[PDB]
Every structure is written in structure tokens, then in C-alpha cells.
């Protein structure tokens, strides 16, 4: 779900420029054991 | 409380 979302809506996030807050949501899933560190890099890359 | 009873398709 993580990348497949941001594959489509990061530019929306980019336009919204809520990047620093979006990762905060992404903070939770690792805090929820939903996603490990490995996919964390994916999201920041897809921002850039 | 009786005024709150309304059954008035026609007249009462």
C-alpha cells in the first residue's frame, strides 16, 4: 500500500507540500510495526 | 403533553 499510493499521489503531496507531516503518518506504521525501515527509504525517494 | 399527539391526515 505504501509505494502504490505514493506512486500516484506524491505529486499531490508535493503540491500540498505536507511532506514533513506525511512522514509523521509514516512514523506511526513503523511504530505500529506495519512497515519496517526498508520501505521508509522508498517514500522519501519518491518525494524526490 | 397531550398537544404533542398529532394524528391529522384529516381533522381531529
Amino acid at each position: 500500500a505504501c509505494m502504490l499510493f505514493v506512486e500516484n499521489y506524491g505529486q499531490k503531496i508535493i503540491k500540498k507540500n505536507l511532506c514533513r507531516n506525511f512522514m509523521l503518518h509514516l512514523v506511526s506504521m513503523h511504530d505500529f510495526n506495519l512497515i519496517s525501515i526498508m520501505s521508509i527509504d522508498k517514500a522519501v525517494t519518491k518525494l524526490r | 403533553x397531550x398537544x404533542x399527539x398529532x394524528x391529522x391526515k384529516x381533522x381531529x
Binding site: - | X4, X6, X8, K9, X10, X11, X12
Partner: protein, 362 residues
Amino acid sequence: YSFKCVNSLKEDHNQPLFGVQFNWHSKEGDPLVFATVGSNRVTLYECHSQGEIRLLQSYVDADADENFYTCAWTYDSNTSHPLLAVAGSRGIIRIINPITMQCIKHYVGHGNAINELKFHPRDPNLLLSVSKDHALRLWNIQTDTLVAIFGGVEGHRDEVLSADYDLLGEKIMSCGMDHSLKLWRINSKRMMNAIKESYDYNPNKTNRPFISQKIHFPDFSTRDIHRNYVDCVRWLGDLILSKSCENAIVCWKPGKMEDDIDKIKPSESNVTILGRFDYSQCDIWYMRFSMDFWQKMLALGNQVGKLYVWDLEVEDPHKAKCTTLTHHKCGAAIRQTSFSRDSSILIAVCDDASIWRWDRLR
């Protein structure tokens, strides 16, 4: 304020009388003809000077053991012929043309029974149908295409009868047994668009039938206006008159006294109440008041047969100078109210298959 009932008639069917309609969609100088429906008989007639109202052509249901309730005129631009639609206990809207002598249009799909009829103020071919179903079906009779329902997931839990378009045609009022007044903005681009593509279609275009919309969040609603039913509410232009079985009549505007109707958020619920042109001895629901084609006067009768009627000018409820026209013979129940296409002539229509005509003492 200066009138008198000068003629009265009655139909032999003896069933209760129902929706009255005056052909405001007409031309000046032309013979003005009015129409009204009973239980299963559709009636069309024209009054004249010297107190005479010539009987006119009129039909009647003979198969559907169904009582008809509401009706309204109709007109077609292509044929240049007016028509008229009627409704009742099964809700199937039927639009007949005296010229064609027959209603040759079929529209089934409502659940129980229509309780509100009105064409769009501008479009001669649209009518949203509020019914007993707690549903709001709009129809393009000209193209025979149903249009979006209104309400649904946030529809009306209880029955709703009264609804109205704004004269310009961008917002819809709706209130009824639920005491809620849910209301939607027509000018929404979503259905501004939808109407446009609704206006054109071909069953041979594609297998997929036309897909209308489903709007579910009304712009505004509340129930604190009337602790009981609300059944007689129409657009006072930018203002919205209102009343209930409590023999009380009032207007209201959304938000505060300085708040425009269009600019308010759909999420706001603040209210502003104003108006006192009230009445008495009409403690029940299911009647239709009336307001003139020129929007200069307001009228209604009483179930005991008296009339509660006033103007719409600078006269305001700061003191609310009453005007209580009446007649002794007519007292059974005036279910329906209508005028002529002016402040001249009025029809008073009684429950016991009878009608009464009030005229201007100009």
C-alpha cells in the same frame, strides 16, 4: 383584502378534492383555464364574467384503484402545446395534453406516492419528485430521462411533502413530517454538468443506461423551526416563509441576518427566524397555501372554511394587520388553494368535492 366569493361549484364524485393548478404558463388575453385533480378524476375548467365557469374537458382514472394527490401544468416548446402532470397514491407521474387528448408518457420507479410536484422555473422539461418514498427523483420528461435522486444516505428518515425551487433556480427547499428542512444547491457544477449530458441521450448510444447522480449532503437543514410537522413552505425569493400545524407562520434565513444564502458553508447550522403572520383553527397538516404569480400577496383558507390572506409588500409582522376573508356556507375543509393569473380571481376548493370562487373587489 378586498374580495368576495362570487361563485361555487361541486363535482358529483364526492371523493376528497386535491391539487389545484392555474395555468400561469399561458399568454395574455388568451382564455384563462384552470385545472385540478380529485381522487381519480382530473379536472380542467375556465371561469368567466357574470360569475360563470364553463365546464371544460376533463378525464378520470378507471383502472388503477389509486387516489391522485398532486398535479401541475406542463408545456412543450416543440409542439407549442401546453400539457399538465398529475400524481397520487402510486406516484406514477402522468402528463396529458388536451390537444393530444392522451398522456402518452410513462414514468414508473417511485416507491409509494408523490407528495410534491414542480417543474423547474426555467426548464420546461424537469420535475423533481418528492414522494412518500423519502426520495427526490428529477425527470426530464422531454427526453424521457430520469435525473439524480437527492438525500439517500443522508435523506429524510421521515416523510417529506413540502419542497420548492428558488425563482432563479439554484437552490431547493424541502421539508415535511421529519420536521427537518434539508436543502440543496442546484448550481453545483456536478449537476450543472449532469443536466447538460442528461439533456442528450440515445438508448442506441451504448448498452450502459444513462447514469445520473446521487447527491446526499444538503446545504442546510434543521428541525428546531417546528416542534411538529412542517408542510407549507415556499421560497420568498431570498427569504423563506414557513409554517406548521401550530397555526403559526414565519420566515427564516440561513445563518444570521447579514449572511448571504450562497456564501454559507454546508456545515453551518446557525439559524435566523423572523415573521409572524399566523392563524388559528387549522391545527392539522396536509394543506397547500398559495402565493401570487406577482409575489405581492399571500393567501390560505382554513379547514373551517375561512381564509387567511395578506399582501407581500412593506406590510410586515411588526404588527401583522390581519385579513380574515371567509364565507359561512364553505366550512368543511379547504384542502387546496389557488388564484387566477393575477390578484383578481381565486378558487377555494373544499374537501367535499366542492369548489368556491373568490373574486377581486377592485
